[PDB]
Structure formats: C-alpha cells, structure tokens
C-alpha cells in the first residue's frame, strides 16, 4: 500500500542480516531489496489455484505510483535515472524466481520453489528458468504499461521501451 | 493342514445381494482329489466347488469349497458343516459355522464434521470426516456419495470397529475423505451413507456442503 | 523355543527417557538357572537383570532379560545381542537386534475438530477429535493435557497408523476424547499434544475452547421515521 | 590456580542432547604433559580427553578436559571429580561437581501478549512479548518458532532470571521480538516456545495472531428523524 520510503541515502548496512558469514562475508543491502512489491507471500494463501497470474498485477503497482511516488524523477528531470531503477528491480526479479537472492526473505523461503514444483508436479517442462525467461518478454512489456499510468511522460524509444531480456 | 471356514459378511451381503460362503483348505500336499463339500445340519448337498486353486509354489495345496444358500438360512443361526476329507486327513474334519445368535442391537448414530478452519485457510485440500458411534453389533458398512455418482473406493479410507471403554458393548468407526480446496469451495453435495442391521431400512445418509455451519452475521431490524 | 529381542519403542523412549531393551526367550524346556544377558555386538555386557519370570504354566520356562542403555548409544546404530543359554540349546544363542536406520522423514500436521453442533443438543456428552496426518515414518505418540495435568488414559481412545493411498508412503491417525458438555461449554481448554521424530523439537500441541470461533456480529437497529 | 569446571547447562543439555562437561586449569606455565581426567563418586574411569590446549601465548596452559558423560549419569545426582595432574606439580587437584539439590521444581506459566493497538496506528512496527514466571529453579531456555522454521537469536532479546519480591524466591523473565506491521497483519503466528525442568515434557508453546483480540459484537442504532 505504501509506495516508497526514503530514497537513496547512506543507510545500507549488514546487521539487518547479522552473522552474514554464510557465503563470503558481510554485505550492505540496497533499498530495492528493502522495499519491493508483493501480494501473496505468507503461507496463509500458501499455494495458488492455477498459476501465477498476478505478479504482473503486483508490478503494475511497482512503478505506476510506487516509482512515481510524486514524480520524483520529474523534478529531478533524469528519466534515465528512473529507467535504471526499474532495470535494477527487473533484474532482481530474475534472481528471485531462480533462487539466487542472498537475503533471508519470506519469498526466499520454499514459497518460490514450493509453487513451481507443484505446477511441475509431473516434471512437465521443468525449465523454470526458461519459462520465466519465456514470460520475461511479456513481463517486461507490461512493466512499462503501468509506467504509462504514471504522469504521461511516455517515450516510445526502444531503449526505454525494449530491454534485451535475453542477456543479463 | 489348516481348514478355514469363511463366514459371509454384512458388507459382502450388501454389495452382492447374496450369501456366498467358502471353505478354504491350505497347507497340504500338492495332490488333487480333495473331498471338500458344504452341508447343512441335515447334510444337504451343495453345488459344485468350481475353480479349484492350483498348487502354490510354496508346496502348499489350496482347495476352495463354495456354497450358495439363501440369506434366511444363514440368518436362522443353523450351523453349516464344511466336510473336509483328504489322504493326509483321513478323519472327516467338521467346520460347523453359524451366525452369532443372541446379540443385542442398538441404533448407530452418525455425524459429519466440516474440515478444519485453518486447514481451509492454508488452501491446499479439505478433509471430510464421517463418524459413526453407539452401535451393536459390529460389521457395519460405509460409503460416500457425490451429487448422485459413487466414488472410487480408494479415494476414501474407512476405519475398523473399536469398543469404547464407556459403553459396554457399543462401538464406533471413522471415515476420511479428501478433496481439493477449490472444489469444496464450490461445495455441492458430499453426502455420506451408512448401512447397518439395526436400521429400519438398513440405510441412512447425511449431507454437508460449503456453507452449512456458517451463522448469521446481521441481526438487522427496522421500525417506523 | 521362541526368542524375541524387542527394540525399544519410540513412544516409550520419549515417555520414560530411560530406554530399556528386552529379550524374551520362552517355550524353553523347564530348567532353572538359565544364562540370559544382554551385550553389544562387540560384547559390552549389561547389569544382571533381576525378577526373572518363573517357569511358564504351559510346561515351559520363561527367560526375561531387561537392559538399560543410553539413548544416544541406542541411536548410534549398533547391534545388540541377547545372549541366551539353556539346557535344550546346544550352543549359546546371540539374538541380534538393530533398528532399521535409513527411513524418510516428514513433519506431520495436527488439527482439532470441535464437537458437532447438533451433537450438542441431546444432552449426554460430546466428542473431540485430534487428527494427525502426513507424518513419516510411523510410531507417533499422542495424549491429552488438561490445565497442565494429564487426563486418565481410559478417557480417550487412540487409533493406529495406516498408510493413506492418496499419496506415496505416509500415515495418519486420530484420537477421540469424550467430555460432558455441561462443563465443556464453560472453558476447559482440553489441549492435545503429539510427539514424533520429524518435529524440530519432538513436541507439539494445540488446543480448543467453547469460544474458538463465532466471528463479530452486528445488531443494526435503524429506526429512521 | 583457578579450575573452571563447567557442567552441561540445562539449556545446552536440551540444545545438544550430547551433554559435555569441561574442566580447565589456569594460572600455570605453558608446559606440556598435562592430564585432565574425570572420575565418578566411586572413582570410575572416564573417556579420554581430547583437544588439549597448546602452548598458548597468554602465558597460561588452559588445558581443557572434555568428557562425554551420559545424561542419566549426570542427572542421577552422583558427584564427579575432575582429577588434574601436571608434570611440574604432581599433586592432582580435586573439583567435585553435582547438581545443587534442594528447592522443589515449580511449574512456570508463560503468557503471550499481542501488540498494543495504540501502537498499530503509526504503521511502523510491532512488538511481541512472551513472559514466563513462577518457576524454580532458574536457567530456563526460551526461543521462537515461526511458520514451521526457527529464527536466529539476533532478531530478539531475552531477560535474565530475576527474583520476584512479591512471591518467595521464584523467578521470571520475558522475551521481546520486534516485527513490522505489514507482515504482522497477514497471519504470521510467531509462536514462542519455552523449556524448563519442571514441565512434564520440558516444552511448552504459545501462539498469537490477528484473531486474538477481535471485538464480539456491535449495538449500533440509527434514529434519523426530525422530532
């Protein structure tokens, strides 16, 4: 419901995940990991009826008003600076689905794996990396769709409207 | 040289509408021509015992004697003798068997319990429990009925009769069925049926749906 | 001559925390002063078990051997040899017993079902069911606790695990407790406690009450006129 | 010369199930050939002591003596002597260890408190407190069990067992956890688990959620009119 807390500033730290001597050593934490939009993360809902038809719904609130948050990059006038913000967050979703993030998040728990193996109960197309990549083309396309719901500073340039999702 | 005499069961009688009974002869030499037959107290002759079991690989013979008698005679309590005579058993073994005449009868009582609230909140599957209690004697039958269609037997699990310590001769039994969460959210019929001898029509059933125990929430009243 | 080296049951192990393995050698010929003891697979002898059962009334002699071992030692995975020597035995017999390590583990799920509402209408009693499901392996232990003091075992009935067919190898069970309703509709938490190896702390419990539901009501009384 | 003879603490007993007792002598030269053995009340032998301290630069030879005593042996009440013998000083030093018996074991009670709703208006965080009280002796062990998985200790703090003057020399403590409200209002039991000797099974549990302090009913009346 809240769109954003305080923006980029020196508050990144390590004691949020203390005893960080888990893989190499202690690391700071970006705001993107601290604040990010999700709807079904508790084991309350746990599983879902058919599929994950609502991550696109979640990211619709990610930048339509979440990144808008008061046109902060309009007065800042650096739209490309906003572009990199979604670029980082979109790449974050790459790691979240693939079980790559290092945080001890609720989403980091089995809830990511538990859903994907349920839909792959018979191991039909176990390409959970590729199907997410398959979904990426539409996942990114709807990502800027809510950006147009923000104030109409729409630019149809391919750089700001078509990222090479194949590479990362 | 074991000789079993399997008596007809209430569930088998209900499923078959017959009174099939059998006499099994096991742990004998692999030699045919076994004198196996069924007789009444008057020694009446029964029809042929077809499908004689082939000698098992464990060197134990198996002979089956099948008999078909009307339900009343078995319910009459008269003992029926399985005549068994073999080369290894020259003495004719007797298997006088009859229903346990002289047992009290009590009306079973049935309940259906909706699935646990937080289990439904967890949203994977729902479990329905059909409970039966306070019946005598044992050997009752249970089944599940869904919107007019029977279900496969393996989809539900039934318990066994068990004497509770409070009631002297009564019993109780359980039945567990599992369905998907959303289909029970639709929640159409899911009725449970029980058969026992003490019933006036030997059949009873109960129903339960998605919104059965939900109480009213708005005691709205208006006046002018 | 029947020899049984009974492994210690997990339920009794948890109940007593003083695991004790037993060796029953019966159907022996009537002969006093038998040589019965417990040893390790390497021969670690135990204390001389007392109160040896007399000769059985069925014209045989009974040999009972009970030994106390540390729980961690039994959980190590060694083999225990019941050493039995009788007159009819030409040579001493080493009954070897060990637990079958290498089974799958799955945490159970526990639910409590309140008594049926129309059951609470004829004014005799009510039943409460504690249901455990999905555990692996078997041999779970359940009981009932009331305000911190356990109730008599006669007051509740516990079933036995059976393999459910809806999924691969798993088990479930249900315990039934009968309670008079006239004090049930007063409080009386009547908590149910379960214990199994797969649990993080081997202990779990839940509870219910008369008021464990009944969401918010509304008594709107609009009188606009 | 001070000899630390640390027995297996009940918290460590429950955590490990492999109770170990340590015995190390300080205020000595960093000299080898040090024997740290253990004997029972009848002077029975003990399993060998391994991982002896080296010639540490701290100018002391803190030769630790580790013994794998069984739980039943230690809880049987028998006292055990840590026999420490050195080459420079041939006389072993005697340290006897056993439980301090005496006061009876009283069962505690644990109460779990939901966060104050007057806190849940600023939309910033929430607090969960499970408080145990009325137990003898001290040294109870508490932690948290959430949605089926344990939590690392650094996200909560506990209180040392303090005597309660109102009652006799009993003890009380409380565990406090800070968790934000956005997840708190979506389930998230955050169960609190306590372990103490006096309990029949030495484990007790407490749970809270949204449906713990909801109102019962309303008596709203609307009498819109112009009389």
Swiss-Prot record, chain C:
| Sugar-bearing residue positions | 51, 58
Instruction: Using the UniProt annotation, give all residue ranges assigned to the region (CH3).
Output: 1-102
In its record, the post-translational modification comment is: N-glycosylated; important for IgM secretion and its localization at the plasma membrane. The interaction with FCMR is glycan-independent.
- The chain positions of domain Ig-like read 8-98, 108-209
Q: What is the effect of changing residue 197 to D?
A: In IMGT allele IGHM*02
Tell me the disulfide pairings in this chain: 23-82, 130-192
Region annotation (CH4) maps to 103-212
Which domain of life does the UniProt lineage start with? Answer: Eukaryota
Subunit structure and binding partners? The basic structural unit of both sIgM and mIgM molecules consists of two identical heavy chains and two identical light chains; disulfide-linked. N-terminal variable regions of the heavy and light chains form the antigen binding sites, whereas the C-terminal constant regions of the heavy chains interact with immune receptors to mediate effector functions.
Functional description taken from the UniProt entry? Constant region of immunoglobulin heavy chains. Immunoglobulins, also known as antibodies, are membrane-bound or secreted glycoproteins produced by B lymphocytes. In the recognition phase of humoral immunity, the membrane-bound immunoglobulins serve as receptors which, upon binding of a specific antigen, trigger the clonal expansion and differentiation of B lymphocytes into immunoglobulins-secreting plasma cells. Secreted immunoglobulins mediate the effector phase of humoral immunity, which results in the elimination of bound antigens.
- Disorder cited: Agammaglobulinemia 1, autosomal recessive: A primary immunodeficiency characterized by profoundly low or absent serum antibodies and low or absent circulating B cells due to an early block of B-cell development. Affected individuals develop severe infections in the first years of life.
What is the designated name of this protein? Immunoglobulin heavy constant mu
Organism of origin is Homo sapiens (Human)
Section covered of the full-length record? 222 to 433 of 474
